[PDB]
Every structure is written in structure tokens, then in C-alpha cells.
């Protein structure tokens, strides 16, 4: 059994050595070893794992919509002693004595427009067509998600780096054996092999995670010399009323009751943040 822990937040990501801006047109997504045998080490209905999977799904949806190829790695059910090699010494039979647990988790189910690679080693590049698939498609950035952060995910990151591919480790779309091990993997990549980011940093229009983030969505929509206070009417500050239709439609994805009326009757940063907050 593995025990759930608090997933890393923005402040838990150490400052990255490199600066690479995310380029959608140059990127691909990796969903690393998210098979049943591996997520079943947290047991049934683990909220930390449900959070991780939900984050990976968000990223995958964005990717598919934006023509960013999505790759999975899957460890094969049958592995001969010659092929498995030293992994038998390190982990024993692994998934090979639970072959029925080889499928990708239900909520991350591949379709035919994704690519599923047979995974033989920690690095998704080893004994696979991954490097050549990426170079041929003109993709030099790899978004990395899945389990387990410090082992296969971190190894693939370093390997990518060595192969001239820019890794983007996604802090809260990973899980590990332990929090310390998870956080070490982020410190390692941040300092030795690439970018470490939060899921929301790759998404083009995520819901405000803070009232500070909300101000950041609203402020460029106003015509003014002075910024408004949080309890100021936004329409007084140049907000086109029609913008609230798009805001409500975006924010309905979290709270099914938020419409134009709910926003319009009290158009303030204070009132809207209060609406987005409710559990």
C-alpha cells in the first residue's frame, strides 16, 4: 500500500534554472504508466489520485483540442527474463503476475488518435520509437505526467533533455511513493534537466485559483487610468457587459448555476471571487 499526501503547490516548485516558454506547436504530452496495477497501490477512490488523474485529463483535453500529440506508456503484460532483465532483481515480477491490471485507468482511456508505446524501462525513450516520433513531428517539448515521479517520470525527463527535448514536469499531475520523493523529483528537474510547472500554467484559460488571479483576468478588460478596488462596480470601470456572458459560460464548468444574471446583479471582484470559491 501507498499513502496519499498533499500534492505540491506553486510555492513548492523551486526556481527553474531554465526559462523555456511553453510552445504548443512544438509540444507533445506524455501520460506515463497510468495503468491499473500502478494506481491501485493507493487503493480504491484515493482523492490525491483522483486529483492527479483530473489534472492529466484537463491537459489531455486541451492537447487533443489543440493538435498536440498525446502519448501513453504502458508496461507489457508478458515480459521474458531476457527482456525484463535486472528489473526482476529490483522489483520482482511487477505487473507480470497481475496481467489483468495492464489497461490504462478508466478516466484516462486512450482513443485511436493517441499513441500507446510499450514501456520496457524507466525511460520512455528506451527501446521505443519516442525520440524519432517527436523529431519527425517537429516537437521538442515533452509535457510529463503520471507515476512514479522520481523513477520513470524523472528518468524520462533527464533522457529527453539529453536527446535535445525540453521536459515540462507537471508538479500536480504526478504522484510518487512519498511526498519527499515527489518533491525531490521537482528539485532535480528544476536544477538539472528542465521546466517544472503547475497544470494551470499550461492551460490557456483555467478558472482563477485565487482572487489575485481573478483580478488578473478582469483588469485588462477595463478602460481606465486607475485600477478598481475589489468592491467597485466593474461596469463603472469600462467593463463591457457582454463579457459576462463568456465569463459565466467559463465559470459554469465549475458551478452549474452561475449565469449572466448572477454575475450582473453585483459586478465586483469581491462578489465574483465569492461565487467561484464555494465548495
Q: Which residues are annotated as part of the binding site for Mg(2+)? A: 223, 238, 240
Q: How far is CA 196 from the centre of its chain?
A: 11
Please compute Rg for the chain using Cα positions: 21
Residue 86 binds a copy of itself, judged by CB under 8 A: yes
Give the binding range for a copy of itself (CB under 8 A) out of 46-54, 104-112, 131-139, 160-168: 160-168
Q: Going along 179-263, which residue ranges are E strands? A: 195-197
* Minimum distance, C-beta of residue 101 to a copy of itself, in the bound complex (Å): 22
Tell me the per-residue interface mask from 74 to 113 with Mg ion, x by CB under 5 A, - otherwise.
-----------------------------x--x-------
Matching residue, cell 491490471: 101
Residue 20 binds a copy of itself, judged by CB under 8 A: yes
Residues placed in the known binding site:
223, 238, 240
* Number of residues written out for the chain: 279
Residues taking part in catalysis:
32-33, 119
171, containing H or E segment: strand 166-175
* Minimum distance, C-beta of residue 121 to Mg ion, in the bound complex (Å): 18
What is residue 117's three-state secondary structure?
strand
Select from a copy of itself, Cl ion, Mg ion, none the partner in contact with residue 43, using the beta carbon and a kind-dependent cut-off of 5 to 8 Å: none
Give the binding range for Cl ion (CB under 5 A) out of 62-70, 79-87, 140-148, 181-189: 140-148
Listed residue (33, 43, 178) closest to 94, CA to CA:
33
Residue 155 binds a copy of itself, judged by CB under 8 A: yes
Burial class of residue 125 in the structure, from the number of CB atoms within 10 Å of its CB (0-12 exposed, 13-18 middle, 19+ buried): buried
Listed residue (236, 276, 227) closest to 253, CA to CA:
276
Residue 193 binds a copy of itself, judged by CB under 8 A: yes
Residue 151 binds Cl ion, judged by CB under 5 A: yes
122 in Cβ contact with 146 (< 8 Å): no
Where does this chain bind a copy of itself (CB under 8 A)? 17-20, 85-86, 89-90, 121-123, 126, 150-151, 155, 158, 161-162, 164, 166, 184, 188, 192-193
Amino acid at each position: 500500500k501507498l499513502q496519499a499526501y498533499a500534492l505540491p503547490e506553486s510555492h513548492d516548485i523551486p526556481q527553474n534554472k531554465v526559462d523555456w516558454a511553453f510552445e504548443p506547436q512544438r509540444a507533445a504530452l506524455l501520460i506515463h504508466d497510468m495503468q491499473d496495477y500502478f494506481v491501485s497501490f493507493w487503493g480504491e477512490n484515493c482523492p490525491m489520485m483522483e486529483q492527479v488523474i483530473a489534472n492529466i485529463a484537463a491537459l489531455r483535453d486541451y492537447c487533443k483540442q489543440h493538435n498536440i500529440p498525446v502519448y501513453y506508456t504502458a508496461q507489457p503484460k508478458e515480459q521474458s527474463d531476457e527482456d525484463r532483465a535486472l528489473l526482476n532483481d529490483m522489483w520482482g515480477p511487477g505487473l507480470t503476475r497481475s496481467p489483468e491490471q495492464q489497461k490504462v485507468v478508466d478516466r484516462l482511456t486512450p482513443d485511436a488518435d493517441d499513441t500507446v508505446l510499450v514501456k520496457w524501462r524507466y525511460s520512455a525513450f528506451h527501446r521505443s520509437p519516442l525520440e524519432q516520433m517527436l523529431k519527425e513531428s517537429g516537437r521538442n517539448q515533452l509535457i510529463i505526467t503520471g507515476v512514479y515521479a522520481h523513477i520513470g517520470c524523472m528518468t524520462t525527463a533527464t533522457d529527453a533533455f539529453m536527446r535535445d527535448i525540453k521536459p515540462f514536469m507537471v508538479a500536480d499531475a504526478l504522484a510518487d511513493f512519498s511526498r519527499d520523493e515527489h518533491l525531490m523529483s521537482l528539485k532535480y528537474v528544476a536544477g538539472r534537466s528542465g521546466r517544472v510547472v503547475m497544470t494551470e500554467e499550461l492551460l490557456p484559460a483555467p478558472i482563477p485559483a485565487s482572487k489575485a488571479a481573478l483580478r488578473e483576468v478582469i483588469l485588462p478588460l477595463l478602460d481606465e487610468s486607475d485600477e478598481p478596488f475589489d468592491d467597485d462596480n466593474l461596469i463603472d470601470y469600462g467593463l463591457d457587459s457582454v463579457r459576462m456572458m463568456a465569463l459565466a459560460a467559463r465559470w459554469r464548468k465549475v458551478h452549474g448555476d452561475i449565469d449572466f444574471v448572477m454575475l450582473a446583479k453585483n459586478p465586483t471582484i469581491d462578489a465574483w471571487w465569492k461565487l467561484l470559491s464555494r465548495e
